[PDB]
Design a protein around this ligand. Structure first.
Ligand SMILES: NS(=O)(=O)/N=C1/NCCO1
Ligand SMILES: [Zn+2]
Length: 257
């Protein structure tokens, strides 16, 4: 199926998923001089104090930390958003080397990794219905640079040995995603898509300006995961990012002056 290799990676996805060449694909390069401060942006609200994490899964493309989204427990509101968006999962994209890994870029700069906190608009009832809507999803994107360790990441790092291969999962209750956030909530926003197949154009992207720092040891452990299943030849899970796509008829707005 689809993946990140030379024979099934981003250059091939359009054959099964023609929206790959659509009008609102993600990620994009964020040209900081072209982005415009938007005074209509209401304050952003990240309310994760009641989050209920459940499980961590290696899905063959990345690992997902999944949340109970059966009630408004961890929600995103404000900023460009109308209404309430419920956290369903987070995951990362990362590189083989520290100089690449992020999906979005900032003035063409690539970060070592990028965290995506995925939320769905509660007006549509379920995630599956939300992904049939142009305002179905909101993804909070956070860049990772290598420097000092991120303490709130370490519990994720330490469980990765138990989900090495595709299809493995582990309990991952009582994880607090507040520990993955930078100090500032300044952000850029634009309308886009999922960055993995099926590449659906349902996402309001909110990309924080401030990266979090993680240690070289932390990202090195991401790179020991495997794309393959148990019993198959080892394919390290690295370079699971889609490059920047054409901006087309979009404007990136900044929340900050
Ligand atoms: N990288 S991404 O756009 O968050 N992609 C997905 N796919 C399912 C939900 O999030
Ligand atoms: Zn993602």
């Amino acid at each position: 199926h689809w993946g990140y290799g030379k024979h099934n990676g981003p250059e091939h996805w359009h054959k099964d998923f023609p929206i790959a060449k659509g009008e609102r694909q993600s990620p994009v390069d964020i040209d900081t001089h072209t982005a415009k401060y938007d005074p209509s942006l209401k304050p952003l609200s990240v309310s994760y104090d009641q989050a209920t994490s459940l499980r961590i899964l290696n899905n063959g493309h990345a690992f997902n930390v999944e949340f109970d989204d059966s009630q408004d427990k961890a929600v995103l509101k404000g900023g460009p958003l109308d209404g309430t968006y419920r956290l369903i999962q987070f995951h990362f994209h990362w590189g083989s080397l520290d100089g690449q890994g992020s999906e979005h870029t900032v003035d063409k700069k690539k970060y070592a990794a990028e965290l995506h906190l995925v939320h769905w608009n509660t007006k549509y009832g379920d995630f599956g219905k939300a992904v049939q809507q142009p305002d179905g999803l909101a993804v909070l994107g956070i860049f990772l640079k290598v420097g000092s360790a991120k303490p709130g990441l370490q519990k994720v790092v330490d469980v990765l040995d138990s989900i090495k291969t595709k299809g493995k999962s582990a309990d991952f209750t009582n994880f607090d995603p507040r520990g993955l956030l930078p100090e500032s909530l300044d952000y850029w926003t634009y309308p886009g898509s999922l960055t993995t197949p099926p590449l659906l154009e349902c996402v309001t992207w909110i990309v924080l300006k401030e990266p979090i720092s993680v240690s070289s040891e932390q990202v090195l452990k991401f790179r020991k995961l495997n794309f393959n299943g148990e019993g198959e030849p080892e394919e390290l899970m690295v370079d699971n990012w889609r490059p920047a796509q054409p901006l087309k008829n979009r404007q990136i707005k900044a929340s900050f002056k």
